[PDB]
Design a protein around this ligand. Structure first.
Ligand SMILES: [Zn+2]
Lengths: 138, 140
């Protein structure tokens, strides 16, 4: 299985949501900085939820359809009052293109998947979403 | 043909190239000056061992020799406007042993691909006078 990343800092303890059969929705909580993310997905028969990061920020739901896939991830990670975190996080599907969300510029990164799909998340979480990473599969 | 391709980072100018996946990247040669001109990639395809010639002519050659059991596990660089043309201006690779580059002297909007689990098995992207964009095939 393929993992790229993670982009960001080192704060907090790690997470590894593992590959899903299909991502159903990603909800991104952001303010100044990207606080957190919610991923709902099917998993070997079971509809399953995980939350990544801390509380608060305004949420924005990315809802994935039948044909709709996570095909790209762009964001900027910077240093926010003493802590290196995801300042802006954005996603794109084969149908639309979301965000990015968050108001703290920094060192950017883009991950455009020309062939394949994002199907997982592994990273590090704190009071804000410290660093995010992706499981890739075709 | 269950391929994972991520990229390409850079411009939109210039003709496309795609070396597919390989069985074994043998050696990569980056041609660079101010910018990244080019990349020569030698690899074993199926039976035979070709080398493909992507990018331009100029700059100095840079030869990343690979040992048996050394894999490309990371690519980073920057891309920017260089004489009215957006090309990759920096580029750097890192294997499970050593970490090569960066080559080229021009800076711009940066990119990074740290591979936590997996490896680089072939390039795609766009060429011309310099390399405008470079992409990459992934496999575990
Ligand atoms: Zn050549």
């Amino acid at each position: 299985a393929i993992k790229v990343g993670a982009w960001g800092g080192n704060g907090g303890s790690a997470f590894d949501m593992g590959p899903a059969y299909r991502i159903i929705s990603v909800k991104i909580f952001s303010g100044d900085v990207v606080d957190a993310v919610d991923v709902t997905f099917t998993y070997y028969g079971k509809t399953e939820t995980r939350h990544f990061g801390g509380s608060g920020g305004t949420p924005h739901e990315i809802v994935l359809q039948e044909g709709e896939y996570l095909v790209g991830m762009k964001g900027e990670f910077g240093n926010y009052h003493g802590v290196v975190v995801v300042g802006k996080l954005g996603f794109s599907t084969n149908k639309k293109s979301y965000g990015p969300f968050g108001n703290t510029g920094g060192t950017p990164f883009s991950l455009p998947i020309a062939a394949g799909k994002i199907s997982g998340f592994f990273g590090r979480g704190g009071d804000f979403i410290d660093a995010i990473g992706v499981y890739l599969e075709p």
